[PDB]
Amino acid sequence: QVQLVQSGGGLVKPGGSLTLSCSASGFFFDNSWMGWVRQAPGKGLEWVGRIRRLKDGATGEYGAAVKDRFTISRDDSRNMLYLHMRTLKTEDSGTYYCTMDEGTPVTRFLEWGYFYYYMAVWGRGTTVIVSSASTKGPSVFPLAPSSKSTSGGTAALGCLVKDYFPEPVTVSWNSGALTSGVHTFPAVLQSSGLYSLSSVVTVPSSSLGTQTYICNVNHKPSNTKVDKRVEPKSC
């Protein structure tokens, strides 16, 4: 099967540079056009560019957002495809997929010489994070249950996991004993460059008097663990 093993990536500062690598096997690499597509976190696909065969002139063509700062190169002797990036910006963060591309000639006479082009096989992707942030563990604040977080006979409570970098954090409740009704939200990137997320749970109001609720937060990158007990508050 076509295999496109991707490597490189990781964290880089804004204004920095990076080369991503794609190792191809399972097809005649030299006779194939190849390309790159990217995807910002939670967003859609964006075309980065493509490169033709050496016998075609090895021409690179680039998407509008990257043309000034990116170069695609190929090394047919090693079945390697590269994406060279410079002057990186925070909005260059995301997943970068290498692609084995194919085409079909258009057979309508007036369009002889044009082709249908498509990205036929995609690699698993490489993550790039462009950020000025330093590693930092979270602060953990309570989302305290009150008269303003009731619904029917239930109450909501939680923890706000704020100002950490990089991803990820993990959150459990009561050391994993409490899973029903838990919602742990995707992290959001704040204007500061630090992440934040909330984890909430709904419980019977009758349990607030007798049951303890502790959110267990682990941030491996900073080797930080926090246990936050969440108590009711008058509101």
Partner: peptide, 17 residues
Amino acid sequence: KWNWFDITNWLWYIRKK
């Protein structure tokens, strides 16, 4: 080496005489 782009180029050459 022969592929879809070669065919495309030949078809261009034919349309332009």
